[PDB]
């Protein structure tokens, strides 16, 4: 089994004066493709009780859903790429992970303070290969903005991560550089084993050495969740299909290339085109 944790979240999405809504997240995107890859997958989430049957299309794509008790769902508004936390769920706590098992979780949070690094050595000792998002350690609410911030205690817990991924401005806020290989030696010297780098035109891993694979199609509408879905196809492919780390970084950019044809989650049908 696969486990991520992270918020749900109503976003709000802005393009040319234009509001539209989309029921998404992190968690979303990433437990999506790992189930229609057919790995066994769960979500450990938090929102409101009125919210969760905007949800309700995870468990119809195979993901068993823990939804935990909120007095609010998480909320951003993106201006198409800058992004504003306009209201946040509860944050996971210890005993949120009471009752974790299977060979892979995955930390994929939306904001700074939604996964309180205190968590992550708890997790630590309960799973065989733990990954997170940068997004939840550098992306930093500020009066609502989502501001791009070093994190600070990240030569404490990178060494904690079997996987750790990057976009393009992530990494360059970690590390002051915006060469993303250069950025990912850095990164794997605070301490990461695996750096998993999406940017534009593909993804990069790096264990020490590096791997490429291009995106072979993508759409304007189709870029949110590459990288949750790029994450997840790797952990699949590497975690759980027993792939070589350069054959697993090969399959992630096909499984996202398809996914980014369209606008939300990885759907049955993408797989059959990859
Ligand atoms: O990766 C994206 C990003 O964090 C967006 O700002 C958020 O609104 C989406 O839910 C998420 O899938
Ligand atoms: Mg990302």
Known sequence: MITFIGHVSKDVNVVDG??????????????????????KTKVITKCTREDVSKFSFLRDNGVEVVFLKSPRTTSIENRYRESFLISAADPFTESDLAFIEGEAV????????????????????????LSADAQGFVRVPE?????????????????????FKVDSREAETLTGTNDLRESCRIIR???????????????IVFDGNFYE???RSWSLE??????????????????FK??????????????????????????REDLEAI
């Open 143 to 163: 009066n609502e903005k989502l501001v791009y911030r070093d994190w600070e205690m990240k030569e404490k817990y990178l060494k904690y991560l079997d996987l």
């Open 222 to 239: 189709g870029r949110t969740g590459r990288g949750d879905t790029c994450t997840a196809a790797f952990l699949v492919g590497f975690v």
């Open 18 to 39: 234009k509001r539209e809504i989309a029921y998404g997240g992190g968690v979303v995107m990433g437990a999506i493709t790992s189930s229609l890859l057919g790995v």
């Open 106 to 129: 995955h930390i994929n949070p939306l904001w700074y303070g939604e996964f309180p690094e205190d968590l992550i050595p708890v997790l630590r000792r309960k799973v065989m290969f």
């Open 242 to 267: 027993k792939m070589s780390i350069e054959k697993a970084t090969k399959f992630a950019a096909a499984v996202t290339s398809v996914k980014m044809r369209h606008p939300g989650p990885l759907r």
């Open 189 to 203: 010297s605070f301490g990461a084993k695996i750096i998993l780098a999406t940017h534009a035109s593909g993804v």
């Open 213 to 215: 694979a291009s995106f």
